[PDB]
Design an enzyme around this catalytic site. Sequence first.
Site, mmCIF file in Angstrom:
data_model
loop_
_atom_site.group_PDB
_atom_site.id
_atom_site.type_symbol
_atom_site.label_atom_id
_atom_site.label_comp_id
_atom_site.label_asym_id
_atom_site.label_seq_id
_atom_site.Cartn_x
_atom_site.Cartn_y
_atom_site.Cartn_z
ATOM 1 N N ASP A 5 0.798 -1.219 0.000
ATOM 2 C CA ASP A 5 0.000 0.000 0.000
ATOM 3 C C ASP A 5 0.836 1.277 0.000
ATOM 4 O OD1 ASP A 5 -2.039 -1.831 0.211
ATOM 5 O OD2 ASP A 5 -3.177 -0.699 1.708
ATOM 6 N N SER A 6 2.150 1.212 0.170
ATOM 7 C CA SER A 6 2.936 2.434 0.140
ATOM 8 C C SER A 6 3.189 2.872 -1.298
ATOM 9 C CB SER A 6 4.260 2.246 0.878
ATOM 10 O OG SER A 6 4.877 1.031 0.507
#
Lengths: 1109, 47, 66, 59
Positions: free
Chosen positions: A734-735
């Site tokens: 998710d980064s």
Amino acid sequence: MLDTESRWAIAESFFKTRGLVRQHLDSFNDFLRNKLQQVIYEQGEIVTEVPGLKIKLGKIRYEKPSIRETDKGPMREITPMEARLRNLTYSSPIFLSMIPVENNIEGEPIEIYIGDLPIMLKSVADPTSNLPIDKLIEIGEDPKDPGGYFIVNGSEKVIIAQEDLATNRVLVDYGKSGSNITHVAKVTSSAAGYRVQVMIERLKDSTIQISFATVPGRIPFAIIMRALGFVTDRDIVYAVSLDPQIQNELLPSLEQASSITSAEEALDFIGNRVAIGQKRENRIQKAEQVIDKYFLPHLGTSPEDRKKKGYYLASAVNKILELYLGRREPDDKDHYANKRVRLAGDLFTSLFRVAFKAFVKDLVYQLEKSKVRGRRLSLTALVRADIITERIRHALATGNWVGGRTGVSQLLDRTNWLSMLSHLRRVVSSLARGQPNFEARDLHGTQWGRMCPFETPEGPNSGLVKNLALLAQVSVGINESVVERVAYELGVVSVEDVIRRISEQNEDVEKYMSWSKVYLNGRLLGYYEDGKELAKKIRESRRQGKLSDEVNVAYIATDYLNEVHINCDAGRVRRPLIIVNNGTPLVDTEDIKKLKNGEITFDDLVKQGKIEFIDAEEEENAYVALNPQDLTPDHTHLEIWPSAILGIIASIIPYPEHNQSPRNTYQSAMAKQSLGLYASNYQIRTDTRAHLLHYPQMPLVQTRMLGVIGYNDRPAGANAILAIMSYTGYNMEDSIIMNKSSIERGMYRSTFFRLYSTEEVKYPGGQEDKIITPEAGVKGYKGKDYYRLLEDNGVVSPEVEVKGGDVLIGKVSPPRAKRDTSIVTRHGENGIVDLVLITETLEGNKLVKVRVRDLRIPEIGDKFATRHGQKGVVGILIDQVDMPYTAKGIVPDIILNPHALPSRMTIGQIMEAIGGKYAALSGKPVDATPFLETPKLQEMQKEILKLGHLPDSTEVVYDGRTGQKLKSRILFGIVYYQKLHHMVADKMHARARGPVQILTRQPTEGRAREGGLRFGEMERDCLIGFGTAMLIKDRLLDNSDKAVVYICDQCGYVGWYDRSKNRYVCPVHGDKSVLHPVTVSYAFKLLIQELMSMVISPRLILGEKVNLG
Amino acid sequence: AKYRCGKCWKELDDDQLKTLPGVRCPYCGYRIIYMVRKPTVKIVKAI
Amino acid sequence: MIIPIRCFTCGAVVADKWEPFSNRVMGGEDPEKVLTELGVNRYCCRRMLLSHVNIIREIIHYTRPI
Amino acid sequence: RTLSLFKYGDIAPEARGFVKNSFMRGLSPYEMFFHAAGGREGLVDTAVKTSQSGYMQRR
Ligand SMILES: [Zn+2]
Ligand SMILES: [Zn+2]
Ligand SMILES: [Zn+2]
């Protein structure tokens, strides 16, 4: 044929004529025009125990909003911006015309001032609702503001719509399993000030009992029927129904009241139920008064209204018997025909009614007391109007409404444009969070076109807080009398007339068992020959303008039911549809041609009988078609806009039909939080917390509703060159990776504004006063260097660098020995003083506001999102040299990991990337409205290929660190990104040591209070599971509330060690015992002490520290 | 220090010496006044 | 608020090309030809020019009274 | 009937929530409604599950 452009023209005309907050404005205008006078007609006139003295009420009126300042004289009109700046309330005075009669002497009419009423912005009472853009700009107003809120004490408050079950209707259901009650019916009668619930049971022994709140226990049905004027059992069984099968079920209930055969016997039976140990007379009058007041107040509160209540009870019993015999099914309770939405108008009329009752009670009490004392009749001298102004305002500024409602009034969420727009259309379910019930949170098929299926919260409130659809419209209601009269003159026959024809004339009941029952607002109105014909007649008369458009009619035909339902009350959510006659819609080419050049509007089409608003009950008889090309002669309506089933925030997603369902809800939640421009005049208004994006950009991939709502003029994001590839592992899970060079050019920079305020209270109770001056010598002095920024007047000057806990405003407070009470900057945050404002708060008190700004540059830990539910934090910032440039020198602005796509299934992300690249290359507009996307993907790809780029939006990429060409091609796009207000600069907090609690001697709580982290039970369980005893002792004892206490060796209580000379002293043994010291948590000592506060005596038994052997 | 009348944004300037019964612009009778920028060289880094 | 001095992705100056492009497009000329003949060829700078909003013309009316 | 777009007493696959399209191809409006109705339960069950798990684990 109606193409896409004509339907969009209809929808755009709808949005242009009536805005997006028409519900609030319509309800408030209706309350202001009608419900204000109706309350005082309901009051009528005030009476006094002293004969000959009373007051007759007249008309009521309001003026332009104004204030009455110090040295009160004529009232001065104000603008909303001045109210915002000076912490005033945007309210208008209300005048009432009253005539006093003193022993039947008229005198003269008197017009008095009874208080101030808050005025909703852009309503009929607001003078700024009919101003040009130039004059709106001149007075300091945002021309695009959709005013539907109130300015109370400077704050902006909004009344959230409350959705709840309909009141004056009968709801039937099955009883709980394994109980003597088989079937239940419930009615919730609503009066002008109170609400009474009546519940009807059907016990195991085939008896029917009615029990409401006031009278304890159950009362048999025939008892109540006799008490209301039904003496003969035939009268009861014919008021219930005309069906012999239904009539057979009344026999046990009829015979259970065979002892009571008169009205008075039922009345004093009820009296014995309510009044114990009293004579017959007072018992019967008490019983009759409680029946007439607290049984069914919506029907009336007069002793000649008992027949209506009896007929209503008979109809309810008939419904429950139909449910028992199997001719019905339990009511859905989620069908929107059973739900009503209370808006600002109803809440205000109830609040004003309560406040007026209190005011008139106080006035009559003061009047009678003064007349007992002895004085002349002067109304103006004892009105005490400040009651009304106090009662309403305190309701708006707290949200604690009458009737037990809480949270109805909330502060407006001005984070950005979309936050305010979504707040002004929210709907909250009343019966919620008491139980899941797994059925009130379902997406009912009735919600189609009325509530957004995506915009709902996540968690306990999922499915209970909803948002209005685009074209939804909340009805306002009309008076029932005209509908009743037109129904009676249409041909229906009253129930009394039918009963008379059946009984006193030799007419069989078989004729009237084939007729259709006709209802009105849930109350049985009569009988009609053919219900379908009556429904068609009502619909045709409504479309011709002879009947009000607020009336909705439905016809229900079943193997056992034949009914016609008519509704004309408020709170019903309706939606518009185009009428189709014989397979051809009533809107033709000429109408759309006249619509496209401004000759007609949406309202003209509605009043011409071509577009009609229908509700859930009427839609049961509807057969709607989505598009004009699948119309059939059996179709009755046509959808105006198929994409109008979404809310106002779900209408900003590009290609929302290619994403998974939860992603759109997540997108709505996150879009309610993005940073951007929230108002044009943000530099002159004072908000507690504000954000500003430096360089916002409007989306390249647009939707049709982005321009209607004005989002392109207040954007909240920027377009980023997105690459889809795996790079360095810093974008896993998710980064995201962002370009540092583009950040250094000012891409996503923002500014954060905070406000501090102070007032010089006058303290009228002792005549001492505040003063804003430096603090040379004062009790609570802080330090010489802290007050180094204040000017000679004690206020810090603009454009200075504040830091940490510097003093902004310096004032002293008289003792309650002057004490230093100065406003200091919050700990752990600094900035630059942005604005200083000095004014007066309507009483001469000095009010000072200081706004401080600071600069926020994106960094590792900042949160970003898209319009498809793809939140994530920045993992690292990479320069332009280290980024993987392409063959033309273009480097990505954001890199997104491919592994996030196949599980979330957001194809709209890639589609938007391709569309944005095409939009930037071609310069042509891109529309991504659902179901009507133009251009198509194939055309866009062909045009991209024609413009010098690969059709699949991939590119040849070289490595920026080594120069080696990658073996594959990488996808590039121009997806639009938003920055959320969850910045890492506001989330760090660490504590080494500091202040402790005064009671438990434990570390304090809060980031501003130097910190302190809680070590819960589960962390202790982890430590135990690892089996580390010394680590447990260090975490839980050494670093919190450690203490040493002395325990007596005989009694076991806590002693002490005084400094007189030297002594170990015991509270009971004195000096005859030896005391030992033990280390222990101080919370345990507090527990022991507060156990001895009760009669429990805990004695501690000591032991040897050193284990012998 | 020195203030500025709030009516029509940057209206006119007044100082401490204007002693009145209330906070009011002596020229236009406006009830809202602001503060001046304290003329002094301020150094900001163009980073 | 106002046009950025440089393109975000590449450091190309783009602020000096706003007042021509904003005018000739309002004169009925298609954006693609104007952008091509103004010297803007990478689609990052085209994105920069095509999606500007220019709010400052409204904010000059509502300015801090400092 | 679920929605007002279908005939009375229709139990055809389309009228009860069978989606014959794909995310790549795109869904029709009523298919979007049916998909949201099917997927609403996940937004709800999580809090109940975590609360029950916490209570059981504490005991
Ligand atoms: Zn002792
Ligand atoms: Zn002035
Ligand atoms: Zn560029």
